[PDB]
């Protein structure tokens, strides 16, 4: 007979251990707190109760592995603007990108 | 027994500040809004 009204639950069943946290290869696409980026190892010193780390503006660029110690700093996936260089469809139809 | 003692009133100086959250930060100057012990306030020095 389950109990769920009062001070937060004790019993529950999260997953665990997807894999080998997946330092580089912009794959390590979550950690504890949901993140989506290139996620690998770092060299920070998280004050061993502190777990994740913001930058100057509230974006978490560091996290510690839960099951291990592993201060992993995260970095966003990649992006930019594909700009297309063309001689002009009157001259030719080849483009550099 | 009743081993009791005295009182006082002291100026709680620049201290009483705790990491308000479990978030790491580096070389930032955060601007929180938590519940702190306001600087240079009065503490009641119980003996």
């Amino acid at each position: 007979s389950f109990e769920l009204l009062h001070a937060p639950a004790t019993v529950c069943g999260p997953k665990k251990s997807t894999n080998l946290v997946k330092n580089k290869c912009v794959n390590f696409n979550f950690n504890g707190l949901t993140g989506t980026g290139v996620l690998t190892k770092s060299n920070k010193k998280f004050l061993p109760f502190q777990q994740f780390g913001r930058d100057i503006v509230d974006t978490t660029d560091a996290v510690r592995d839960p099951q291990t110690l592993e201060i992993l700093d995260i970095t966003p996936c990649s992006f930019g603007g594909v700009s297309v260089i063309t001689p002009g469809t009157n001259t030719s139809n080849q483009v550099a990108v | 027994n009743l081993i009791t003692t005295t009182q006082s009133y002291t100026n709680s100086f620049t201290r009483g500040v705790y990491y308000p959250d479990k978030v790491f930060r580096s070389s930032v100057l955060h601007l929180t809004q938590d519940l702190f012990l306001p600087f240079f306030s009065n503490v009641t020095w119980f003996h």
């Binding site: 009062h6 001070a7 937060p8 004050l47 109760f49 | 002291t10 709680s12 620049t14 201290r15 009483g16 500040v17 705790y18 990491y19 479990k22 012990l37 306030s41 009065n42 503490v43 009641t44 020095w45 119980f46 003996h47």
Partner: peptide, 28 residues
């Protein structure tokens, strides 16, 4: 200057209003 790193949460939905020591003692 010294900061006070957390020790524990103890999720306790209880309503406190008083306290006191037993066996210094600057309540702020």
């Amino acid at each position: 200057f010294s900061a006070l790193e957390p020790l524990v949460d103890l999720p306790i939905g209880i309503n406190i209003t008083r306290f006191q020591t037993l066996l210094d003692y600057y309540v702020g």
